[PDB]
Short mmCIF file of C-alpha atoms (C1' of nucleotides) in Angstrom, two decimals:
data_model
loop_
_atom_site.label_atom_id
_atom_site.label_comp_id
_atom_site.label_asym_id
_atom_site.label_seq_id
_atom_site.Cartn_x
_atom_site.Cartn_y
_atom_site.Cartn_z
CA UNK X 1 -50.70 164.76 -226.35
CA UNK X 2 -51.13 167.00 -223.25
CA UNK X 3 -49.79 164.96 -220.43
CA UNK X 4 -48.97 166.45 -217.15
CA UNK X 5 -45.93 164.86 -215.58
CA UNK X 6 -47.21 162.09 -213.05
CA UNK X 7 -45.16 159.86 -210.93
CA UNK X 8 -46.47 156.21 -210.14
CA UNK X 9 -46.10 155.62 -206.43
CA UNK X 10 -46.91 152.36 -204.85
CA UNK X 11 -47.80 152.09 -200.94
CA UNK X 12 -48.71 148.34 -201.04
CA UNK X 13 -46.19 146.53 -198.68
CA UNK X 14 -45.95 143.56 -201.21
CA UNK X 15 -42.68 143.53 -202.90
CA UNK X 16 -40.86 141.14 -205.22
CA UNK X 17 -39.25 138.10 -203.32
CA UNK X 18 -36.91 135.55 -204.55
CA UNK X 19 -37.62 134.88 -208.22
CA UNK X 20 -39.75 137.89 -208.62
CA UNK X 21 -36.96 140.53 -208.33
CA UNK X 22 -34.59 138.81 -210.84
CA UNK X 23 -37.63 138.12 -213.17
CA UNK X 24 -38.62 141.70 -213.26
CA UNK X 25 -34.97 142.87 -213.49
CA UNK X 26 -34.30 140.74 -216.51
CA UNK X 27 -37.65 141.80 -217.94
CA UNK X 28 -36.54 145.57 -217.82
CA UNK X 29 -33.06 144.94 -219.09
CA UNK X 30 -34.39 142.90 -221.98
CA UNK X 31 -37.27 145.37 -222.71
CA UNK X 32 -34.86 148.32 -222.75
CA UNK X 33 -33.48 147.31 -226.04
CA UNK X 34 -36.46 147.77 -228.29
CA UNK X 35 -37.52 144.19 -229.19
CA UNK X 36 -41.27 144.38 -230.23
CA UNK X 37 -42.23 140.87 -229.03
CA UNK X 38 -41.98 140.03 -225.23
CA UNK X 39 -43.37 136.97 -223.67
CA UNK X 40 -43.92 136.48 -219.98
CA UNK X 41 -45.07 133.36 -218.13
CA UNK X 42 -46.80 133.81 -214.77
CA UNK X 43 -49.18 131.78 -212.60
CA UNK X 44 -51.93 132.80 -210.18
CA UNK X 45 -51.49 133.70 -206.51
CA UNK X 46 -48.51 135.94 -207.24
CA UNK X 47 -50.07 139.31 -207.88
CA UNK X 48 -50.14 139.78 -211.65
CA UNK X 49 -51.61 143.25 -211.18
CA UNK X 50 -48.80 144.01 -208.62
CA UNK X 51 -46.21 143.10 -211.32
CA UNK X 52 -47.93 145.31 -213.80
CA UNK X 53 -47.71 148.03 -211.21
CA UNK X 54 -44.13 147.54 -210.56
CA UNK X 55 -43.29 147.67 -214.27
CA UNK X 56 -45.49 150.70 -214.53
CA UNK X 57 -43.83 152.60 -211.82
CA UNK X 58 -40.31 151.62 -213.01
CA UNK X 59 -41.31 152.48 -216.61
CA UNK X 60 -43.25 155.99 -216.07
CA UNK X 61 -45.33 155.59 -219.21
CA UNK X 62 -49.11 155.83 -219.90
CA UNK X 63 -50.23 152.29 -219.83
CA UNK X 64 -52.82 150.34 -221.53
CA UNK X 65 -53.55 146.84 -220.00
CA UNK X 66 -55.53 144.14 -221.72
CA UNK X 67 -58.02 141.81 -220.29
CA UNK X 68 -60.29 139.17 -222.00
CA UNK X 69 -63.36 139.40 -219.76
CA UNK X 70 -65.11 141.34 -216.98
CA UNK X 71 -64.37 139.30 -213.90
CA UNK X 72 -60.65 139.86 -214.64
CA UNK X 73 -60.31 143.41 -215.88
CA UNK X 74 -62.80 144.80 -213.03
CA UNK X 75 -60.64 143.70 -210.04
CA UNK X 76 -57.33 144.36 -212.09
CA UNK X 77 -58.37 147.97 -212.36
CA UNK X 78 -59.44 148.04 -208.69
CA UNK X 79 -56.15 146.78 -207.68
CA UNK X 80 -54.16 149.30 -209.89
CA UNK X 81 -56.33 151.88 -208.17
CA UNK X 82 -55.18 150.56 -204.82
CA UNK X 83 -51.42 150.73 -205.38
CA UNK X 84 -51.85 153.73 -207.62
CA UNK X 85 -54.28 156.03 -205.91
CA UNK X 86 -52.71 159.34 -207.01
CA UNK X 87 -52.40 158.17 -210.57
CA UNK X 88 -55.67 157.81 -212.66
CA UNK X 89 -56.63 153.96 -213.13
CA UNK X 90 -59.89 153.32 -215.02
CA UNK X 91 -61.82 150.85 -216.96
CA UNK X 92 -62.56 151.80 -220.53
CA UNK X 93 -64.42 149.28 -222.66
CA UNK X 94 -67.09 148.44 -220.17
CA UNK X 95 -70.03 150.70 -220.78
CA UNK X 96 -72.59 148.23 -219.39
CA UNK X 97 -73.81 146.23 -216.45
CA UNK X 98 -75.68 144.01 -219.03
CA UNK X 99 -76.08 144.23 -222.74
CA UNK X 100 -77.79 142.83 -225.72
CA UNK X 101 -76.36 142.94 -229.30
CA UNK X 102 -77.83 144.84 -232.30
CA UNK X 103 -76.68 141.92 -234.20
CA UNK X 104 -78.07 139.66 -236.98
CA UNK X 105 -78.18 135.84 -236.41
CA UNK X 106 -78.17 134.49 -239.90
CA UNK X 107 -79.17 131.07 -239.17
CA UNK X 108 -82.41 132.19 -237.44
CA UNK X 109 -82.58 135.40 -239.63
CA UNK X 110 -83.14 137.59 -236.48
CA UNK X 111 -82.07 141.20 -236.25
CA UNK X 112 -81.77 141.91 -232.65
CA UNK X 113 -81.62 145.54 -231.58
CA UNK X 114 -79.16 147.27 -229.26
CA UNK X 115 -80.02 147.12 -225.47
CA UNK X 116 -77.85 148.96 -222.90
CA UNK X 117 -77.80 149.27 -219.11
CA UNK X 118 -75.21 152.03 -218.57
CA UNK X 119 -73.74 152.20 -215.07
CA UNK X 120 -72.93 155.75 -214.04
CA UNK X 121 -69.58 154.88 -212.48
CA UNK X 122 -68.86 152.48 -215.35
CA UNK X 123 -69.25 155.24 -217.92
CA UNK X 124 -67.50 157.59 -215.69
CA UNK X 125 -64.42 155.24 -215.74
CA UNK X 126 -64.60 155.17 -219.52
CA UNK X 127 -64.83 158.92 -220.11
CA UNK X 128 -62.19 159.24 -217.51
CA UNK X 129 -59.88 157.20 -219.59
CA UNK X 130 -60.78 158.89 -222.74
CA UNK X 131 -60.32 162.36 -221.17
CA UNK X 132 -57.38 161.87 -218.62
CA UNK X 133 -55.51 160.17 -221.49
CA UNK X 134 -55.27 163.58 -222.99
CA UNK X 135 -54.88 165.59 -219.64
CA UNK X 136 -52.26 163.58 -217.71
CA UNK X 137 -49.29 161.11 -218.24
CA UNK X 138 -49.95 158.93 -215.20
CA UNK X 139 -52.84 157.13 -216.64
CA UNK X 140 -53.42 153.37 -216.47
CA UNK X 141 -56.40 152.12 -218.58
CA UNK X 142 -57.61 148.50 -218.48
CA UNK X 143 -59.67 147.41 -221.52
CA UNK X 144 -61.05 144.31 -223.38
CA UNK X 145 -60.65 143.73 -227.16
CA UNK X 146 -62.94 146.52 -227.94
CA UNK X 147 -59.89 148.87 -227.26
CA UNK X 148 -59.14 148.16 -230.98
CA UNK X 149 -62.54 149.66 -231.89
CA UNK X 150 -62.54 152.94 -233.65
CA UNK X 151 -63.36 155.92 -231.54
CA UNK X 152 -62.79 159.54 -232.36
CA UNK X 153 -59.39 160.99 -233.13
CA UNK X 154 -57.73 162.26 -229.74
CA UNK X 155 -56.82 165.45 -231.64
CA UNK X 156 -60.27 166.72 -231.85
CA UNK X 157 -60.85 165.41 -228.27
CA UNK X 158 -57.95 167.67 -227.16
CA UNK X 159 -58.24 170.94 -229.40
CA UNK X 160 -61.81 170.99 -230.86
CA UNK X 161 -63.44 171.42 -227.53
CA UNK X 162 -63.04 174.69 -225.36
CA UNK X 163 -60.99 175.63 -222.49
CA UNK X 164 -62.45 178.17 -219.81
CA UNK X 165 -60.18 180.20 -217.55
CA UNK X 166 -61.30 182.89 -215.11
CA UNK X 167 -61.68 186.59 -216.28
CA UNK X 168 -61.88 185.89 -220.08
CA UNK X 169 -64.35 187.72 -222.37
CA UNK X 170 -66.39 184.76 -223.65
CA UNK X 171 -70.08 185.53 -224.48
CA UNK X 172 -73.01 183.40 -223.22
CA UNK X 173 -74.06 182.88 -226.82
CA UNK X 174 -70.57 181.50 -227.73
CA UNK X 175 -70.62 179.31 -224.56
CA UNK X 176 -73.93 177.81 -225.61
CA UNK X 177 -72.99 177.27 -229.15
CA UNK X 178 -69.84 175.39 -228.07
CA UNK X 179 -71.76 173.46 -225.47
CA UNK X 180 -74.18 172.40 -228.24
CA UNK X 181 -71.04 171.67 -230.33
CA UNK X 182 -69.63 169.21 -227.70
CA UNK X 183 -72.54 167.04 -227.43
CA UNK X 184 -74.59 168.21 -224.61
CA UNK X 185 -78.25 168.30 -223.95
CA UNK X 186 -80.75 170.81 -222.45
CA UNK X 187 -82.10 170.02 -219.05
CA UNK X 188 -83.10 172.54 -216.29
CA UNK X 189 -85.21 171.22 -213.39
CA UNK X 190 -83.16 168.06 -212.93
CA UNK X 191 -79.36 167.60 -213.28
CA UNK X 192 -78.69 164.51 -215.67
CA UNK X 193 -75.60 163.57 -217.34
CA UNK X 194 -74.38 165.99 -220.05
CA UNK X 195 -76.80 168.82 -219.66
CA UNK X 196 -76.49 172.46 -218.84
CA UNK X 197 -78.38 174.38 -216.24
CA UNK X 198 -78.74 177.66 -217.81
CA UNK X 199 -80.25 180.20 -215.41
CA UNK X 200 -79.06 183.93 -216.05
CA UNK X 201 -75.43 184.40 -214.77
CA UNK X 202 -75.14 180.68 -213.69
CA UNK X 203 -74.10 177.81 -216.14
CA UNK X 204 -73.78 174.45 -214.45
CA UNK X 205 -72.45 171.37 -216.35
CA UNK X 206 -71.94 167.62 -215.67
CA UNK X 207 -68.98 166.29 -217.66
CA UNK X 208 -69.14 162.82 -218.85
CA UNK X 209 -65.71 162.12 -217.42
CA UNK X 210 -66.34 163.95 -213.93
CA UNK X 211 -69.73 162.95 -212.74
CA UNK X 212 -69.63 166.04 -210.41
CA UNK X 213 -70.97 169.42 -211.40
CA UNK X 214 -68.90 172.44 -212.72
CA UNK X 215 -70.43 175.88 -212.22
CA UNK X 216 -69.51 179.15 -214.04
CA UNK X 217 -70.85 182.35 -212.84
CA UNK X 218 -70.84 185.16 -215.34
CA UNK X 219 -70.46 189.03 -215.03
CA UNK X 220 -71.71 190.54 -218.10
CA UNK X 221 -70.27 188.81 -221.39
CA UNK X 222 -67.23 187.77 -219.41
CA UNK X 223 -67.19 184.80 -217.05
CA UNK X 224 -66.67 185.88 -213.39
CA UNK X 225 -65.95 182.76 -211.40
CA UNK X 226 -65.71 179.12 -211.76
CA UNK X 227 -66.05 176.28 -209.14
CA UNK X 228 -66.55 172.58 -208.62
CA UNK X 229 -70.01 171.79 -206.98
CA UNK X 230 -72.13 168.77 -206.25
CA UNK X 231 -74.58 168.04 -209.19
CA UNK X 232 -77.80 168.01 -206.98
CA UNK X 233 -76.75 169.91 -203.86
CA UNK X 234 -73.87 172.17 -204.88
CA UNK X 235 -71.60 171.22 -202.22
CA UNK X 236 -68.34 173.43 -202.42
CA UNK X 237 -65.35 171.10 -203.08
CA UNK X 238 -62.35 173.52 -203.98
CA UNK X 239 -61.18 176.45 -206.00
CA UNK X 240 -60.38 175.80 -209.68
CA UNK X 241 -59.45 178.32 -212.57
CA UNK X 242 -58.63 176.64 -215.75
CA UNK X 243 -60.72 173.83 -217.27
CA UNK X 244 -60.06 172.30 -220.75
CA UNK X 245 -63.61 170.71 -221.04
CA UNK X 246 -63.97 167.58 -223.02
CA UNK X 247 -67.27 166.54 -224.89
CA UNK X 248 -69.61 163.93 -223.50
CA UNK X 249 -68.54 161.75 -226.51
CA UNK X 250 -65.33 160.12 -227.67
CA UNK X 251 -66.18 161.16 -231.19
CA UNK X 252 -65.50 164.86 -230.63
CA UNK X 253 -65.96 167.11 -233.74
CA UNK X 254 -65.95 170.72 -234.30
CA UNK X 255 -67.66 172.50 -237.20
CA UNK X 256 -65.13 171.56 -239.77
CA UNK X 257 -65.12 168.04 -238.64
CA UNK X 258 -68.85 168.03 -239.10
CA UNK X 259 -68.11 169.12 -242.61
CA UNK X 260 -65.42 166.33 -242.98
CA UNK X 261 -67.84 163.80 -241.54
CA UNK X 262 -70.63 164.86 -243.91
CA UNK X 263 -68.47 164.76 -246.90
CA UNK X 264 -67.19 161.16 -246.19
CA UNK X 265 -70.66 160.04 -245.15
CA UNK X 266 -72.01 161.28 -248.57
CA UNK X 267 -69.17 159.64 -250.55
CA UNK X 268 -69.25 156.32 -248.76
CA UNK X 269 -73.09 156.49 -249.07
CA UNK X 270 -72.74 156.84 -252.75
CA UNK X 271 -70.27 153.88 -252.94
CA UNK X 272 -72.52 151.66 -250.77
CA UNK X 273 -75.62 152.69 -253.09
CA UNK X 274 -73.68 151.77 -256.14
CA UNK X 275 -72.56 148.48 -254.63
CA UNK X 276 -76.09 147.61 -253.39
CA UNK X 277 -77.49 148.45 -256.83
CA UNK X 278 -75.04 146.18 -258.48
CA UNK X 279 -75.83 143.42 -255.92
CA UNK X 280 -79.57 143.98 -256.39
CA UNK X 281 -80.35 144.54 -252.80
CA UNK X 282 -83.14 147.17 -253.24
CA UNK X 283 -84.81 146.76 -249.85
CA UNK X 284 -81.43 146.65 -248.07
CA UNK X 285 -80.23 149.88 -249.92
CA UNK X 286 -83.64 151.61 -248.91
CA UNK X 287 -83.32 150.49 -245.34
CA UNK X 288 -79.64 151.95 -245.19
CA UNK X 289 -80.82 155.23 -246.92
CA UNK X 290 -83.56 155.72 -244.53
CA UNK X 291 -81.23 154.90 -241.57
CA UNK X 292 -78.55 157.43 -242.83
CA UNK X 293 -81.12 160.07 -243.77
CA UNK X 294 -82.13 160.06 -240.06
CA UNK X 295 -78.47 159.73 -239.30
CA UNK X 296 -77.22 162.88 -241.24
CA UNK X 297 -79.37 165.87 -240.28
CA UNK X 298 -79.14 166.02 -236.68
CA UNK X 299 -75.47 165.72 -236.38
CA UNK X 300 -75.27 169.21 -237.72
CA UNK X 301 -77.94 170.02 -235.28
CA UNK X 302 -76.59 168.49 -232.13
CA UNK X 303 -74.61 165.32 -232.88
CA UNK X 304 -75.37 162.69 -230.28
CA UNK X 305 -77.16 159.47 -231.31
CA UNK X 306 -76.87 155.70 -231.28
CA UNK X 307 -74.64 154.13 -233.84
CA UNK X 308 -72.31 157.06 -234.20
CA UNK X 309 -69.42 154.48 -234.08
CA UNK X 310 -70.66 153.02 -237.40
CA UNK X 311 -69.63 156.50 -238.95
CA UNK X 312 -66.71 156.92 -236.70
CA UNK X 313 -64.38 156.64 -239.77
CA UNK X 314 -66.14 159.42 -241.35
CA UNK X 315 -65.57 161.49 -238.32
CA UNK X 316 -61.82 160.49 -238.11
CA UNK X 317 -61.02 161.37 -241.77
CA UNK X 318 -59.20 158.05 -242.26
CA UNK X 319 -59.65 155.55 -245.15
CA UNK X 320 -60.99 152.11 -245.70
CA UNK X 321 -58.63 149.33 -244.60
CA UNK X 322 -56.48 151.88 -242.59
CA UNK X 323 -56.25 151.09 -238.78
CA UNK X 324 -59.09 152.60 -237.14
CA UNK X 325 -58.50 155.59 -234.56
CA UNK X 326 -58.58 153.85 -231.32
CA UNK X 327 -57.39 154.26 -227.88
CA UNK X 328 -53.85 153.80 -229.10
CA UNK X 329 -53.87 157.05 -230.86
CA UNK X 330 -54.77 158.62 -227.60
CA UNK X 331 -51.53 157.30 -226.07
CA UNK X 332 -48.35 158.73 -227.24
CA UNK X 333 -45.71 156.96 -229.27
CA UNK X 334 -43.78 156.01 -226.08
CA UNK X 335 -46.83 154.41 -224.25
CA UNK X 336 -46.70 150.85 -222.64
CA UNK X 337 -49.06 148.08 -223.39
CA UNK X 338 -49.74 145.04 -221.30
CA UNK X 339 -51.56 141.72 -222.18
"C1'" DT Q 1 -69.55 130.20 -228.90
"C1'" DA Q 2 -69.20 134.11 -226.11
"C1'" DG Q 3 -67.92 139.24 -223.98
"C1'" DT Q 4 -67.45 142.95 -227.91
"C1'" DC Q 5 -70.64 147.86 -230.27
"C1'" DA Q 6 -73.67 155.24 -227.73
"C1'" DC Q 7 -75.00 158.16 -222.62
"C1'" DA Q 8 -81.87 156.60 -228.29
"C1'" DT Q 9 -85.58 156.79 -229.70
"C1'" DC Q 10 -89.66 154.21 -229.45
"C1'" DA Q 11 -95.47 153.05 -228.50
"C1'" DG Q 12 -98.18 152.90 -226.12
"C1'" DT Q 13 -98.39 151.06 -221.17
"C1'" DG Q 14 -102.15 153.70 -219.70
"C1'" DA Q 15 -102.91 156.93 -212.99
"C1'" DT Q 16 -103.25 161.80 -211.88
"C1'" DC Q 17 -104.15 167.46 -212.68
"C1'" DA Q 18 -106.71 170.33 -214.94
"C1'" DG Q 19 -109.86 172.73 -218.54
"C1'" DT Q 20 -114.67 173.09 -217.85
"C1'" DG Q 21 -120.35 171.30 -216.22
"C1'" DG Q 22 -124.13 171.86 -213.92
"C1'" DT Q 23 -126.69 173.57 -209.59
"C1'" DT Q 24 -130.04 176.24 -204.85
"C1'" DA Q 25 -137.40 185.79 -197.03
"C1'" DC Q 26 -139.32 189.42 -191.37
"C1'" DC Q 27 -142.23 192.66 -194.10
"C1'" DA Q 28 -145.83 193.52 -197.52
"C1'" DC Q 29 -151.41 195.05 -199.87
"C1'" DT Q 30 -155.02 194.09 -201.06
"C1'" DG Q 31 -158.80 190.43 -199.79
"C1'" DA Q 32 -162.33 190.91 -196.08
"C1'" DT Q 33 -166.23 189.81 -192.69
"C1'" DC Q 34 -167.99 191.64 -188.74
"C1'" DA Q 35 -165.58 193.64 -185.91
"C1'" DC Q 36 -167.83 199.97 -183.91
"C1'" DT Q 37 -170.56 205.35 -184.09
#
DNA sequence: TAGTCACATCAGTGATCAGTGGTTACCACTGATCACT
């Protein structure tokens, strides 16, 4: 919802020539009338990312572009960063340099556990998408099919976290409660991702969306100053005053959202227990109950775990069969989609 | 048949730090025989 007015400016010398100007002009004339299905044909060696950038800059909408693999989306995002440097261009689905599914091969009867290799810049781009989508309008996000996978609702991502502005009377206890309510950990000697350095008047944080460090220095029970500093060295960058912080997860949830998630988890657990009792799957129901028992208590303690997406609906408050809350909800009703 | 799912816990796997654990006499007096009257 919150989207600062951004203008897409392209400095690349490449411009439409010959068939390209007429093609893009007709594309715009025939897109302005509201038809929901739009088919473009286009070969290689012509700058498809360039055409997407031209459409983006002459449409001025938050854009979600769609790619079916890595060796396309990665360089597409790099290009749209090149011709849109001021605007935020990032890669969302990503999350790995390599991955192994937590899947079940039925033919071999093999349950393979989840394995991840999270690149810091890759998850930086992902969380930059999920955050700047709710902080600015000039956002271009590239994603694979997992963009239609259910994350948390953008409403909670934008209003159930906290905003800090200089010279406000917010106690340290409330700050720590909100930090542990926005999925952050407790680490002092080193500075890792999503942990708070708490030393007297100094509270240093590393957002998931900005890999750098944010330091707030207190004066009593009222914050005195706020700055952007390097994580491990504390290098001064600039002077900032207002920061609407976002949690280290896309499944943001305040206390009442924990209540809603717990109630939904309980009701669907009862439904699934009844279904498995009717199906005669005693061992399966037991395994699910042990997994959910480990996956209920520590959400109301801190929240962050592996497999939180499997309960994402319970966080969102939606119903079965309804479209899951995805990156589309983060976009407004006037967003642009590219395939 | 392959690029999709979160910033997690394992269970040791298996060197180093650090509690403990033990270990190593100049004089001086009486002794005293043959030193003395």
